[PDB]
C-alpha cells in the first residue's frame, strides 16, 4: 500500500457560558 | 446592563498547533495507559502522534474567522479589500492582502471582550493519574484541557522527544502547569468569584 | 559560561570518556589493550594530508537549536546516520566562528541563538577557535572541497594499531585487528562512543596551545584512538569470529584501509557513501590538527 | 532510519532521451525536484533471486 | 509462577514465592531488557525479550537467531553462484555486493 | 563606539510629529536650540527643564565638549535636515563620518518618563512600513472597509451634505489629530488645563483605554516572527536535491562575481551566423553569447519588470549550462512546507517566476525530507540525478514549534528534529499588577 | 570536426569495476569510483573531467550507460567509444537533420552494428538580418566522429 | 518616449532616454502634481496633473 500524509489543527471548543441554576456555596 | 463582555468558557487561543503527518510511521508498542490521565494527556498525544513530519504554530483559524474578512489557508491573514487600487480591480493574490491581514488581525484583537467563565472541569483523585502529571496537574482542569508538548513527558513514544522536554522541565528556568493555581484575585467577587486557571 | 581549565575541558570529570567493556565501565586506553594485530604482505604508507580548503561555509541564521555534538558523533559513530551533509547545522557553526557571534555553544552540544543564561556554555573565544575549523565539515559533500576517503585512513592505520616505531617510519604494514569480545562488541562499541561528548576533545583540540596542547595529545591518544577504531570498523573489508578455545575473537581486516563499502551489515556500522565523505573530511581535519 | 516498505512517493521523472544533435532550450524548466534519466526503459533487474 | 506474588490468595504460595524473589540468588523479568544484541541490525533490529519460556526452546531460539545473524550472506555470494552455472564471462549488475 | 553608542538624532518632522505636542501638553519649557556657542551646562539645564534627552539644532559647528556631553547623557538633538550633518560637529577625532550613522526606531517611552501619554510602540511604526504609500481616497476606501467587516454604516462619514453644493468629501486622514481649542482668528492655541476640558489633554488615538491594553497585545502578535509568513526574495540555481531541510539556501560558491542585473548587461549580438543573447560580463567586458561558458555569476535581480523573453530563458539557461546562481529579490511567496508523502502537488516553470506580477503573491511549496526512510537495499541504482532550481533566500519554517516526532534507531535523535521551544511550557505566573510572566530563571 | 580534449581531463579506461550501485542520501546510486584517486562519485553532477575510453562496451550494465551519458552531460566528461562503426553522410544546411541517432542505442548495440551519422556542413547557412531579434534555442551536438 | 526607461528591447534607446532622465535639466513625471482645496470647504478644488 502507498504511504499517506495526513494533517490536524486543535479545534476550538469556546462556547457561550453556562446559565446554571445551581449555586456552588452558601 | 450594557453587554460590554461576551462571556465563554473554554476560550480560544489567537494562535494554535497544526501539525502534518507522515502516516507510515507508528510504534510497534502500543501505549495502554491510565483513564484519568488519558483524558487530560490525551488530546496533546493525539495531537503528537508518532509520525507528526512537522508542527506549526499558525494564528487560529476558528477565531481569525472569515467574518472577520481574513482568510488563513495559505498562512497568512488575507483581507480581501482593504488596500487596494482605486479606478481597477485589485486582482488577484495581492501581497497588499497580507498586510490588510495584519490590520484585521490587529483589529479584531483589539475588540476581543471575551471574558472567560469556568466551563466543565474534572477533579481527579490523584492515584488515578501518573506522578508526572500529577506534578503538573493542580487539582482541577478544564475537561477540554487543549493542548501543550509539556504533556508528551513521559508518553510520547519517542525518546529523545522525551527526553529533551523532560530535560526542559527538570531545568528551574521553565516550569509547566495546569488548571486551578492560586493567583492574588482569588477570593475576589464581582457577582460570582474569580478564580485562576 | 564554563571557563577552560589550562588543561582544556577534558580535564574536567565532566567529560570523561568510558567505554563499556562486554558491558563493564573501562578507559578507551583498557579496551585498546586488547586489539592485537596480524599483520600482512600489504604496506600502508601515509601521504601528507592536503591542506583543507579555507572557505567556511556561509553563516546563514537558522532557525532553532542546532544539535551539533549529536550530529557529529551520530555521522561518525551512530547506526544508520542521516542527513549528515544536510547544510544548516554547519551554517549555525560558522556562526560560531565569527569574532563577536550572539550563539553559544552550551555543554549539551547545543547551540542556542539567545544569551541564554540558564545553560552552561563552553567560551566563545574556544568554540570560535573550533568551529573555524570545523565548520568546514559543511563542505564535505561539496565536489571542489571533498576529502581524500581513500588514503586518509592510512593514517587512522597509524593512529591506531601502528607500533610508535611505525609512527616513526611513517609506514607500517596493513594490520588484522583481533581481540576477546562479547556478543555485539563493536555495535556496542560505537554506542558506548556515540554518546561522548567529543566536543570537549575537539575544542581542546583547537584551543589548547604549546605545552598544553600537547600535554593534552598524550593524555588524549587512546580517546582519539578509540574514535579511530569506530570508523575503522565500519570502514574494514570484512569482520569476523574466531572461536578460540572457549573464547571468540573479534577480528577486522583490515586496519588502515577503507573499504568504500556502503551496505549495511551485522557486525558494525556502515557509512554510506555520504558518511564516507563526512568522515573523511572530519579525518582531514582532525588530523591537521592533531599534527602540529 | 528503517527501510521503507509502503510504496513511497516519488518525485517527476523527465526523461530527456538525447540524440546526435539537439536544441535544448529551458524555458518551461521543471522548478521542483524532478528526476533526470536520460535512456528509454531502465528496469533491466529482472532476474529476481529468491 | 513468580507473577503470582502478591496475587495468589494462598498465603503459603505468596510467602514462599515472595521469599525465593527476594533472594539475591533468583531475580524475574519480563518483555523488553537490554542485551549484548540490542541496535544490531539484521534487515530489523534485534532486540531481548524475557518471555514465559522454557530455557531449551529459549535456547534454541537464540541460537537460530545467532546463526542467522553471523551467516553474513550477501549478494555477492549470490552473483557467484550464478556466475558459476551461466556461461563464462557473462555479466552481472545486481545490487550493492555487500 | 559600538553600534548602540553614538549621538542620537531624529529629523525635525519626527520631533514635530510625537515629541513636541507631548512637550506642550506636559507643561515644560520648549527645548533650547543648540548654536553651537552653547555649553553643554546649557544642554544639562535645559534636559532638567523638559524631563527630555532632547534639544533642537540651531546653527553650525557644535564645540567638542558640549557633542562629548551629547553623546554622553543620549540627548536627542533633532536635525532640520540629514544633509552633510558631520559639518555641523566639530570632531577633533575626524572620526565622526557621512555614512557612519545607525538609523533606528526609539521608542517614545524610552524617552518620555509620563507613561500616561504614551499607548503605542516600535510596532506599529514597523506595520505602517510594510503598508503602501496610501491615498487619501485609498485611506477612505480602508476605513469604510474595516466598517463593512464590522457592520457598521459609515454613509456621508467624512463627507458634506449641502444642499446646493451637494455631497462633498473630506480627507479622512488625520495621523496623530489632537482636539484643540482654536483662536477666533482660526488657528490654533496650545492646550490649557485651565479652560478647556482634561478630556481633551491627549487624545489617545480616539481610542477606549481597554482597546489600547488589546492594542498592546496585537501589536505585539502582528511584530511576532511566528506569524510573519510572507517570505521575500528566491534563489535559483542549479543543485541535487541533497538537503532534507525546508529551510535551506544553497551557499555561493567561492568563485563567483556579484553582479546586479540590468538591461544594459543583455543585447542581441551576432555570433557564429547567429543572433546571440550575448551577456557581457562587467568585471572584464568579454562579451558570451552562448548560456554556457559564460563566467559563474550571482547575478541579483532587483527587479524583474522589463525583462525580455529571450533574456529570462537566457538568464535561467546559463543558471544551467553555466552554473550562475540568480538570487530575484522582487518575489513576494507564501511557502507551504511538505511532507515527503504528500510530495508536490503544485508545480512551476521558470518562466512563471520570471513573469509574475510584482505584486501578486507567489505561493511556493518546499519539501521536508526528514521523514524519509532508507530504500531497500535491493533497489535498482537510480542512474539519473534528482534537480532542484528554487530555493528560499531566507528562513521558512519560521512558524516550526516540533520536527521529526519519531525515533532514529529507537533511540537516538534523527538529524533535524527539533523539540519545541522551552518558553512553549512556562506556565509561568502573573506579576502584582496582572501581566503574564515566564518562571523566574535561576535564583532569585 | 573532431573536438580536442580540454587541458584538465584524464584518461580512463572503462571497466565493469568502475561503476557500482551504493548508498548515498537515502538512494542507490550507479556510483562511479575514478581509477587515480579511488573516491566514489554517486552522482553524476560532482565527477572529475575525465576522457573516458570504452574500448568494449559489451557486458556493460544499462544503467551504467545512461550514468556515463549523465555524466557527459552534468560532469562534461568526454567519452571515447572505440567499437562503434558507421557511415556517415554529410547534409548541405538547406537539407537539413533527415535522422537522428539517440545515445541511448551507441551505448547499448551488438558490437557489429553499422550506425549512420549525419552531419550538416554550416559553411552556407544564410546570414541572420542584422537587426532580427535572437532566437532562444541553443542547438548542440553530443556524438563526434574521431576521424575525418 | 519617457516610459520607454527599462522597458524597451531596443538597447541604445533606453540607454539614451535613460541617460536625459538622468540629466538634472529633466525629470519626467506622470500624475496629480498638485491640489488646491477650498479655504472654507476644505475640499479638494483645482489639482494640476
Same mark, same amino acid.
Given at each position: 500500500?502507498?504511504?499517506?500524509?495526513?494533517?490536524?489543527?486543535?479545534?476550538?471548543?469556546?462556547?457561550?457560558?453556562?446559565?446554571?441554576?445551581?449555586?456552588?456555596?452558601? | 446592563?450594557?453587554?460590554?463582555?461576551?462571556?465563554?468558557?473554554?476560550?480560544?487561543?489567537?494562535?494554535?498547533?497544526?501539525?502534518?503527518?507522515?502516516?507510515?510511521?507508528?510504534?510497534?508498542?502500543?501505549? /495502554?495507559?491510565?483513564?484519568?490521565?488519558?483524558?487530560?494527556?490525551?488530546?496533546?498525544?493525539?495531537?503528537?502522534?508518532?509520525?507528526?513530519?512537522? %508542527?506549526?504554530?499558525?494564528?487560529?483559524?476558528?477565531?481569525?474567522?472569515?467574518?472577520?474578512?481574513?482568510?488563513?489557508?495559505?498562512?497568512?491573514?488575507?483581507?480581501?479589500?482593504?488596500?487596494?487600487?482605486?479606478?481597477?480591480?485589485?486582482?488577484?493574490?495581492?501581497?497588499?492582502?497580507?498586510?490588510?491581514?495584519?490590520?484585521?488581525?490587529?483589529?479584531?484583537?483589539?475588540?476581543?471582550?471575551?471574558?472567560?467563565?469556568?466551563?466543565?472541569?474534572?477533579?481527579?483523585?490523584?492515584?488515578?493519574?501518573?506522578?508526572?502529571?500529577?506534578?503538573?496537574?493542580?487539582?482541577?482542569?478544564?475537561?477540554?484541557?487543549?493542548?501543550?508538548?509539556?504533556?508528551?513527558?513521559?508518553?510520547?513514544?519517542?525518546?529523545?522527544?522525551?527526553?529533551?522536554?523532560?530535560?526542559?522541565?527538570?531545568?528551574?528556568?521553565?516550569?509547566?502547569? *495546569?488548571?486551578?493555581?492560586?493567583?492574588?484575585?482569588?477570593?475576589?467577587?464581582?457577582?460570582?468569584?474569580?478564580?485562576?486557571? | 559560561?564554563?571557563?577552560?581549565? +589550562?588543561?582544556?575541558?577534558?580535564?574536567?570529570?565532566?567529560?570523561?570518556?568510558?567505554? /563499556?567493556?562486554?558491558?563493564?565501565?573501562?578507559?578507551?586506553?583498557?579496551?585498546?589493550?586488547?586489539?592485537?594485530?596480524?599483520? +600482512?604482505?600489504?604496506?600502508?604508507?601515509?601521504?601528507?594530508?592536503?591542506?583543507? =580548503?579555507?572557505?567556511?561555509?556561509?553563516?546563514?541564521?537558522?532557525?532553532?537549536?542546532?544539535?551539533?555534538?549529536?550530529?557529529?558523533?551520530?555521522?561518525?559513530?551512530?547506526?544508520?546516520?542521516?542527513?549528515?551533509?544536510?547544510?544548516?547545522?554547519?551554517?549555525?557553526?560558522?556562526?560560531?566562528?565569527?569574532?563577536?557571534?550572539?550563539?553559544?555553544?552550551?555543554?549539551?552540544? %547545543?547551540?542556542?541563538?539567545?544569551?541564554?543564561?540558564?545553560?552552561?556554555?563552553?567560551?566563545?573565544?574556544?568554540?570560535?577557535?573550533?568551529?573555524?575549523?570545523?565548520?568546514?565539515?559543511?563542505?564535505?559533500?561539496?565536489?571542489?572541497?571533498?576529502?581524500?576517503?581513500?588514503?586518509?585512513?592510512?593514517?587512522?592505520?597509524?593512529? *591506531?594499531?601502528?607500533?610508535?616505531?611505525? &609512527?616513526?617510519?611513517?609506514? #607500517?604494514?596493513?594490520?588484522?585487528?583481533?581481540?576477546?569480545?562479547?556478543?555485539?562488541?563493536?555495535?556496542?562499541?560505537?554506542?558506548?562512543?556515540?554518546?561522548?561528548?567529543?566536543?570537549?576533545?575537539?575544542?581542546?583540540?583547537?584551543?589548547?596551545?604549546? =605545552?598544553?596542547?600537547?600535554?593534552?595529545?598524550?593524555?588524549?591518544?587512546?580517546?582519539? /584512538?578509540?574514535?579511530?577504531?569506530?570508523?575503522?570498523?565500519?570502514?574494514?573489508?570484512?569482520?569476523?569470529? /574466531?572461536?578460540?578455545?572457549?573464547?571468540?575473537? $573479534?577480528?577486522?581486516?583490515?586496519?588502515?584501509?577503507?573499504?568504500?563499502?556502503?551496505?549495511?551489515?551485522?557486525? +558494525?556500522?556502515?557509512?554510506?557513501?555520504?558518511?564516507?565523505?563526512?568522515?573523511?573530511?572530519?579525518?582531514?581535519?582532525?588530523?591537521?590538527?592533531?599534527?602540529? | 532510519?528503517?527501510?521503507?516498505?509502503?510504496?513511497?512517493?516519488?518525485?517527476?521523472? %523527465?526523461?530527456?532521451?538525447?540524440?546526435?544533435?539537439?536544441?535544448?532550450?529551458?524555458?518551461?524548466?521543471?522548478?521542483?525536484?524532478?528526476?533526470?534519466?536520460?535512456?528509454?526503459?531502465?528496469?533491466?533487474?529482472?532476474?529476481?533471486?529468491? | 509462577?513468580?507473577?503470582?506474588?502478591?496475587?495468589?490468595?494462598?498465603?503459603?504460595?505468596?510467602?514462599?514465592?515472595?521469599?525465593?524473589?527476594?533472594?539475591?540468588?533468583?531475580?524475574?523479568?519480563?518483555?523488553?531488557?537490554?542485551?549484548? *544484541?540490542?541496535?544490531?541490525?539484521?534487515?530489523?533490529?534485534?532486540?531481548?525479550?524475557?518471555?514465559?519460556?522454557?530455557?531449551?526452546?529459549?535456547?534454541?531460539?537464540?541460537?537460530?537467531?545467532?546463526?542467522?545473524?553471523?551467516?553474513?550472506?550477501?549478494?555477492?555470494?549470490?552473483?557467484?553462484?550464478?556466475?558459476?552455472?551461466?556461461?563464462?564471462?557473462?555479466?552481472?549488475?545486481?545490487?550493492?555486493?555487500? | 563606539?559600538?553600534?548602540?553608542?553614538?549621538?542620537?538624532?531624529?529629523?525635525?518632522?519626527?520631533?514635530?510629529?510625537?515629541?513636541?505636542? &507631548?512637550?506642550?501638553?506636559?507643561?515644560?519649557?520648549?527645548?533650547?536650540?543648540?548654536?553651537?556657542?552653547?555649553?553643554?551646562?546649557?544642554?544639562?539645564?535645559?534636559?532638567?527643564?523638559?524631563?527630555?534627552?532632547?534639544?533642537?539644532?540651531?546653527?553650525?559647528?557644535?564645540?567638542?565638549?558640549?557633542?562629548?556631553?551629547?553623546?554622553?547623557?543620549?540627548?536627542?538633538?533633532?536635525?532640520?535636515?540629514?544633509?552633510?550633518?558631520?559639518?555641523?560637529?566639530?570632531?577633533?577625532?575626524?572620526?565622526?563620518?557621512?555614512?557612519?550613522?545607525?538609523?533606528?526606531?526609539?521608542?517614545?517611552?524610552?524617552?518620555?518618563?509620563?507613561?500616561?501619554?504614551?499607548?503605542?510602540?516600535?510596532?506599529?511604526?514597523?506595520?505602517?512600513?510594510?503598508?503602501?504609500?496610501?491615498?487619501?481616497?485609498?485611506? $477612505?476606501?480602508?476605513?469604510?472597509?474595516?466598517?463593512?467587516?464590522?457592520?457598521?454604516?459609515?454613509?456621508?462619514?467624512?463627507?458634506?451634505?449641502?444642499?446646493?453644493?451637494?455631497?462633498?468629501?473630506?480627507?479622512?486622514?488625520?495621523?496623530?489629530?489632537?482636539?484643540?481649542?482654536?483662536?477666533?482668528?482660526?488657528?490654533?492655541?496650545?492646550?490649557?488645563?485651565?479652560?478647556?476640558?482634561?478630556?481633551?489633554?491627549?487624545?489617545?488615538?480616539?481610542?477606549?483605554?481597554?482597546?489600547?491594553?488589546?492594542?498592546?497585545?496585537?501589536?505585539?502578535?502582528?511584530?511576532?516572527?511566528?506569524?510573519?509568513?510572507?517570505?521575500?526574495?528566491?534563489?535559483? #540555481?542549479?543543485?541535487?536535491?541533497?538537503?532534507?531541510?525546508?529551510?535551506?539556501?544553497?551557499?555561493?560558491?567561492?568563485?563567483?562575481?556579484?553582479?546586479?542585473?540590468?538591461?544594459?548587461?543583455?543585447?542581441?549580438? *551576432?555570433?557564429?551566423?547567429?543572433?546571440?543573447?550575448?551577456?557581457?560580463?562587467?568585471?572584464?567586458?568579454?562579451?558570451?553569447?552562448?548560456?554556457?561558458?559564460?563566467?559563474?555569476?550571482?547575478?541579483?535581480?532587483?527587479?524583474?519588470?522589463?525583462?525580455?523573453?529571450?533574456?529570462?530563458?537566457?538568464?535561467?539557461?546559463?543558471?544551467?549550462?553555466?552554473?550562475?546562481?540568480?538570487?530575484?529579490?522582487?518575489?513576494?511567496?507564501?511557502?507551504?512546507?511538505?511532507?515527503?508523502?504528500?510530495?508536490?502537488?503544485?508545480?512551476?516553470?521558470?518562466?512563471?517566476?520570471?513573469?509574475?506580477?510584482?505584486?501578486?503573491?507567489?505561493?511556493?511549496?518546499?519539501?521536508?525530507?526528514?521523514?524519509?526512510?532508507?530504500?531497500?537495499?535491493?533497489?535498482?541504482?537510480?542512474?539519473?540525478?534528482?534537480?532542484?532550481?528554487?530555493?528560499?533566500?531566507?528562513?521558512?519554517?519560521?512558524?516550526?514549534?516540533?520536527?521529526?516526532?519519531?525515533?532514529?534507531?529507537?533511540?537516538? &535523535?534523527?538529524?533535524?528534529?527539533?523539540?519545541?521551544?522551552?518558553?512553549?511550557?512556562? +506556565?509561568?505566573?502573573?506579576?502584582?499588577?496582572?501581566?503574564?510572566?515566564?518562571?523566574? %530563571?535561576?535564583?532569585?
Amino acid at each position: 500500500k502507498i504511504a499517506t500524509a495526513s494533517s490536524a489543527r486543535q479545534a476550538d471548543v469556546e462556547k457561550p457560558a453556562d446559565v446554571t441554576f445551581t449555586i456552588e456555596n452558601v | 446592563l450594557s453587554d460590554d463582555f461576551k462571556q465563554i468558557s473554554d476560550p480560544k487561543g489567537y494562535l494554535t498547533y497544526s501539525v502534518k503527518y507522515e502516516d507510515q510511521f507508528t510504534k510497534k508498542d502500543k501505549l /495502554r495507559a491510565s483513564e484519568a490521565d488519558d483524558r487530560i494527556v490525551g488530546p496533546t498525544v493525539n495531537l503528537f502522534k508518532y509520525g507528526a513530519a512537522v %508542527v506549526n504554530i499558525d494564528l487560529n483559524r476558528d477565531f481569525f474567522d472569515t467574518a472577520t474578512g481574513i482568510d488563513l489557508t495559505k498562512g497568512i491573514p488575507l483581507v480581501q479589500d482593504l488596500l487596494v487600487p482605486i479606478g481597477v480591480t485589485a486582482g488577484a493574490e495581492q501581497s497588499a492582502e497580507y498586510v490588510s491581514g495584519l490590520l484585521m488581525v490587529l483589529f479584531k484583537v483589539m475588540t476581543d471582550n471575551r471574558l472567560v467563565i469556568v466551563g466543565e472541569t474534572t477533579t481527579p483523585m490523584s492515584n488515578t493519574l501518573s506522578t508526572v502529571v500529577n506534578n503538573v496537574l493542580r487539582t482541577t482542569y478544564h475537561n477540554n484541557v487543549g493542548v501543550n508538548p509539556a504533556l508528551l513527558r513521559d508518553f510520547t513514544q519517542v525518546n529523545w522527544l522525551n527526553r529533551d522536554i523532560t530535560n526542559m522541565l527538570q531545568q528551574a528556568g521553565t516550569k509547566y502547569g *495546569l488548571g486551578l493555581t492560586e493567583t492574588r484575585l482569588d477570593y475576589v467577587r464581582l457577582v460570582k468569584t474569580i478564580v485562576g486557571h | 559560561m564554563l571557563q577552560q581549565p +589550562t588543561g582544556g575541558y577534558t580535564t574536567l570529570e565532566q567529560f570523561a570518556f568510558t567505554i /563499556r567493556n562486554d558491558g563493564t565501565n573501562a578507559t578507551p586506553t583498557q579496551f585498546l589493550q586488547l586489539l592485537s594485530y596480524e599483520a +600482512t604482505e600489504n604496506e600502508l604508507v601515509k601521504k601528507t594530508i592536503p591542506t583543507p =580548503e579555507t572557505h567556511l561555509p556561509s553563516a546563514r541564521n537558522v532557525p532553532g537549536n542546532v544539535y551539533i555534538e549529536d550530529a557529529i558523533t551520530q555521522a561518525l559513530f551512530g547506526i544508520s546516520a542521516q542527513n549528515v551533509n544536510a547544510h544548516g547545522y554547519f551554517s549555525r557553526l560558522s556562526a560560531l566562528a565569527l569574532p563577536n557571534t550572539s550563539a553559544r555553544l552550551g555543554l549539551d552540544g %547545543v547551540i542556542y541563538n539567545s544569551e541564554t543564561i540558564n545553560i552552561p556554555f563552553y567560551d566563545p573565544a574556544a568554540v570560535a577557535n573550533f568551529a573555524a575549523t570545523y565548520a568546514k565539515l559543511g563542505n564535505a559533500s561539496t565536489p571542489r572541497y571533498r576529502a581524500d576517503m581513500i588514503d586518509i585512513y592510512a593514517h587512522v592505520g597509524l593512529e *591506531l594499531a601502528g607500533t610508535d616505531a611505525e &609512527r616513526a617510519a611513517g609506514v #607500517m604494514p596493513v594490520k588484522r585487528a583481533k581481540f576477546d569480545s562479547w556478543e555485539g562488541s563493536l555495535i556496542s562499541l560505537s554506542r558506548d562512543v556515540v554518546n561522548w561528548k567529543i566536543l570537549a576533545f575537539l575544542i581542546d583540540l583547537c584551543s589548547l596551545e604549546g =605545552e598544553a596542547l600537547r600535554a593534552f595529545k598524550t593524555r588524549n591518544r587512546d580517546v582519539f /584512538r578509540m574514535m579511530l577504531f569506530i570508523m575503522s570498523t565500519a570502514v574494514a573489508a570484512n569482520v569476523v569470529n /574466531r572461536k578460540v578455545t572457549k573464547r571468540v575473537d $573479534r577480528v577486522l581486516e583490515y586496519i588502515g584501509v577503507n573499504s568504500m563499502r556502503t551496505a549495511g551489515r551485522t557486525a +558494525t556500522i556502515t557509512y554510506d557513501l555520504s558518511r564516507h565523505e563526512f568522515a573523511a573530511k572530519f579525518l582531514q581535519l582532525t588530523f591537521t590538527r592533531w599534527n602540529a | 532510519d528503517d527501510v521503507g516498505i509502503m510504496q513511497q512517493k516519488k518525485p517527476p521523472t %523527465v526523461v530527456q532521451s538525447r540524440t546526435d544533435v539537439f536544441n535544448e532550450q529551458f524555458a518551461n524548466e521543471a522548478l521542483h525536484p524532478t528526476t533526470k534519466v536520460i535512456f528509454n526503459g531502465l528496469d533491466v533487474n529482472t532476474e529476481v533471486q529468491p | 509462577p513468580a507473577l503470582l506474588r502478591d496475587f495468589t490468595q494462598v498465603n503459603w504460595l505468596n510467602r514462599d514465592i515472595t521469599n525465593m524473589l527476594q533472594q539475591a540468588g533468583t531475580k524475574y523479568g519480563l518483555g523488553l531488557t537490554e542485551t549484548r *544484541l540490542d541496535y544490531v541490525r539484521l534487515v530489523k533490529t534485534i532486540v531481548g525479550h524475557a518471555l514465559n519460556i522454557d530455557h531449551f526452546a529459549a535456547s534454541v531460539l537464540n541460537i537460530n537467531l545467532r546463526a542467522l545473524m553471523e551467516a553474513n550472506v550477501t549478494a555477492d555470494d549470490r552473483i557467484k553462484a550464478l556466475q558459476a552455472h551461466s556461461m563464462i564471462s557473462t555479466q552481472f549488475h545486481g545490487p550493492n555486493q555487500g | 563606539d559600538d553600534l548602540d553608542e553614538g549621538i542620537r538624532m531624529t529629523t525635525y518632522d519626527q520631533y514635530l510629529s510625537h515629541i513636541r505636542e &507631548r512637550l506642550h501638553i506636559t507643561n515644560v519649557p520648549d527645548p533650547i536650540y543648540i548654536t553651537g556657542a552653547s555649553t553643554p551646562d546649557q544642554i544639562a539645564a535645559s534636559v532638567q527643564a523638559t524631563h527630555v534627552a532632547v534639544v533642537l539644532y540651531q546653527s553650525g559647528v557644535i564645540n567638542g565638549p558640549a557633542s562629548t556631553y551629547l553623546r554622553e547623557n543620549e540627548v536627542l538633538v533633532v536635525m532640520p535636515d540629514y544633509y552633510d550633518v558631520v559639518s555641523r560637529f566639530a570632531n577633533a577625532n575626524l572620526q565622526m563620518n557621512n555614512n557612519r550613522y545607525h538609523e533606528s526606531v526609539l521608542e517614545i517611552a524610552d524617552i518620555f518618563d509620563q507613561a500616561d501619554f504614551i499607548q503605542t510602540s516600535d510596532a506599529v511604526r514597523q506595520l505602517r512600513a510594510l503598508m503602501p504609500t496610501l491615498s487619501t481616497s485609498q485611506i $477612505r476606501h480602508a476605513i469604510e472597509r474595516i466598517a463593512q467587516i464590522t457592520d457598521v454604516d459609515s454613509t456621508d462619514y467624512g463627507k458634506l451634505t449641502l444642499r446646493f453644493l451637494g455631497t462633498l468629501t473630506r480627507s479622512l486622514k488625520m495621523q496623530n489629530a489632537q482636539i484643540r481649542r482654536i483662536r477666533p482668528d482660526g488657528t490654533v492655541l496650545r492646550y490649557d488645563d485651565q479652560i478647556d476640558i482634561e478630556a481633551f489633554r491627549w487624545s489617545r488615538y480616539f481610542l477606549d483605554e481597554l482597546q489600547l491594553r488589546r492594542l498592546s497585545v496585537g501589536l505585539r502578535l502582528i511584530t511576532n516572527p511566528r506569524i510573519a509568513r510572507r517570505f521575500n526574495g528566491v534563489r535559483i #540555481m542549479y543543485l541535487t536535491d541533497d538537503d532534507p531541510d525546508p529551510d535551506f539556501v544553497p551557499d555561493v560558491p567561492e568563485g563567483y562575481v556579484a553582479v546586479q542585473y540590468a538591461h544594459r548587461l543583455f543585447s542581441s549580438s *551576432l555570433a557564429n551566423k547567429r543572433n546571440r543573447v550575448t551577456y557581457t560580463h562587467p568585471p572584464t567586458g568579454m562579451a558570451y553569447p552562448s548560456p554556457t561558458g559564460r563566467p559563474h555569476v550571482h547575478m541579483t535581480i532587483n527587479e524583474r519588470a522589463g525583462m525580455s523573453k529571450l533574456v529570462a530563458d537566457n538568464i535561467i539557461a546559463s543558471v544551467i549550462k553555466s552554473n550562475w546562481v540568480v538570487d530575484i529579490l522582487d518575489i513576494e511567496y507564501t511557502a507551504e512546507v511538505m511532507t515527503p508523502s504528500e510530495g508536490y502537488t503544485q508545480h512551476v516553470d521558470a518562466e512563471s517566476i520570471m513573469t509574475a506580477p510584482k505584486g501578486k503573491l507567489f505561493h511556493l511549496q518546499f519539501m521536508d525530507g526528514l521523514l524519509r526512510p532508507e530504500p531497500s537495499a535491493f533497489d535498482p541504482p537510480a542512474s539519473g540525478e534528482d534537480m532542484r532550481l528554487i530555493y528560499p533566500l531566507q528562513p521558512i519554517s519560521v512558524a516550526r514549534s516540533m520536527r521529526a516526532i519519531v525515533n532514529h534507531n529507537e533511540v537516538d &535523535r534523527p538529524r533535524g528534529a527539533v523539540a519545541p521551544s522551552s518558553y512553549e511550557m512556562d +506556565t509561568g505566573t502573573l506579576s502584582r499588577n496582572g501581566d503574564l510572566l515566564y518562571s523566574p %530563571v535561576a535564583n532569585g
